[PDB]
């Protein structure tokens, strides 16, 4: 059955050689890898992916606006992660880091980003919509170390810490370039996904969000904060 | 058995969901169909491809020179057709038709490509190594219709002509956008695999060159001259 489990937002067929399961990326065409998780920014192209002929709809305008700013199309090197510089614009430039966002100032078509700087520390801030009480730290830990460890296929030693009190929880994802090995998944490509699946827009292909229950009660999130730290410090 | 029988220039293996076998383009990670014919683009990505570490190997010297002066790194749009705009690395650019060869004269990083022109007349000019006589034009005409319908999976309709005389062949092939359908192989792309295939750096998997027997007599092609016709002429 042509499916590609970790990540929907792709277009799959049995048409290879002798009915072989083909399967592509929505959008940039680039090639997945459905058993484990798709580089971040073949999935925010396949995000934005302009529908090949809109037909009867109707296309975003040059003025209209979203809500996130953060939101474009980015252009991905044949490896898969971001290209050091993103030009989306007309004239306009800059330089972005691992998971995608601006490490500069805008600047002009002659710009130059050397390295891709590499987001080595995330920490993702998440507040549950209040229950009578608070929940046991340690019930959350295994729970959210286990959700990293199984269904984004991140290494256990890559979840830093788990951080909790009344509503507002924090988990640390320390990944620097040493520490990281052949086929290891990277921290923004897990944070990406769990920030996905937590704001209900899951990219694998059963499910349609996050269930996060820990011990019997569910967990359902109001507000989520990631925070991105890099190795070099942005130049503003 | 993980194998792409018509781009060698993938790299598969049963890395896929429950074992399945995913394969990606060769220097451009892109993903590929097996079953039929790869772009021209994404194989001349593939052709130079900058291995990866060296380690032991080289980098071409930048005052060195290759025998081919078409021949370049290009910029594969999303689904696999050449950017209309090309720019090898630097500040010169230049437009190109859907075959990929020049249409305009060498400009700077301000060039507006404003449509892929397409190619739509395909001319193939072998002359063969003299055997004792010549063959029937009969056999010949059947032989590389054949090959064109078989192998390289283009359809019958769009190899317009064939001409022989003293040694000289000529194929001519024939598709406008018209008539060029849900699926239907370029003859940019067929004629791509079969001039790889006459210089012996076939394409396909099993094979390494082209056999090229008509009514059993070996034809071994010592030139061969190919030239694209554009919907609209190339301006210089
Ligand atoms: C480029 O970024 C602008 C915001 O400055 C946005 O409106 C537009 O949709 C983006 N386009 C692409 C192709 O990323
Ligand atoms: C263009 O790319 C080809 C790739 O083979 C390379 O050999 C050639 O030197 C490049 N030329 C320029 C001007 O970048």
């Known amino acids: 059955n042509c499916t590609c489990p970790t990540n929907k ?39 934005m992916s302009a529908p090949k002929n809109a037909r ?28 050091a510089r993103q030009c989306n614009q007309t004239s306009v430039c800059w330089c972005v880091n691992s998971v995608g966002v ?3 100032d805008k600047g002009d078509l002659s710009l130059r980003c050397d390295e891709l700087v590499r987001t080595h520390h995330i920490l993702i801030d998440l507040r549950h919509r209040p229950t009578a009480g608070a929940f046991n730290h340690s019930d959350l830990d295994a729970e959210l170390r286990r959700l990293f460890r199984e ?8 979840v830093a810490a788990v951080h909790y ?13 040493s520490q990281k090995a052949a086929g290891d998944v990277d921290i923004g490509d897990a944070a990406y996904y769990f920030e996905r699946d937590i704001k209900g827009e899951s990219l694998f292909q059963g ?14 999130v109001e507000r989520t904060l990631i925070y991105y730290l890099d190795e070099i410090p942005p130049k503003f």
């Open 9 to 47: 937002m792709t277009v799959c067929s049995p048409d290879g050689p002798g009915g072989r399961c083909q399967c592509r990326a929505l959008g940039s065409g680039m090639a997945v890898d459905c058993s484990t998780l798709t580089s971040k920014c073949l999935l925010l192209k396949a995000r």
């Open 56 to 83: 009867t709809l109707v296309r975003p305008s040059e003025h209209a606006l979203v809500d996130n700013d953060g939101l474009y199309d980015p252009d991905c090197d044949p490896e898969g992660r971001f290209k």
């Open 102 to 104: 601006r490490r500069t």
């Open 151 to 158: 269904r984004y296929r991140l290494h256990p030693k890559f």
């Open 165 to 177: 009190e009344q509503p507002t929880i924090q988990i640390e994802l320390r990944q620097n370039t």
């Open 207 to 220: 499910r349609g969000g996050l269930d996060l229950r820990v011990r019997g009660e569910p967990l359902q």
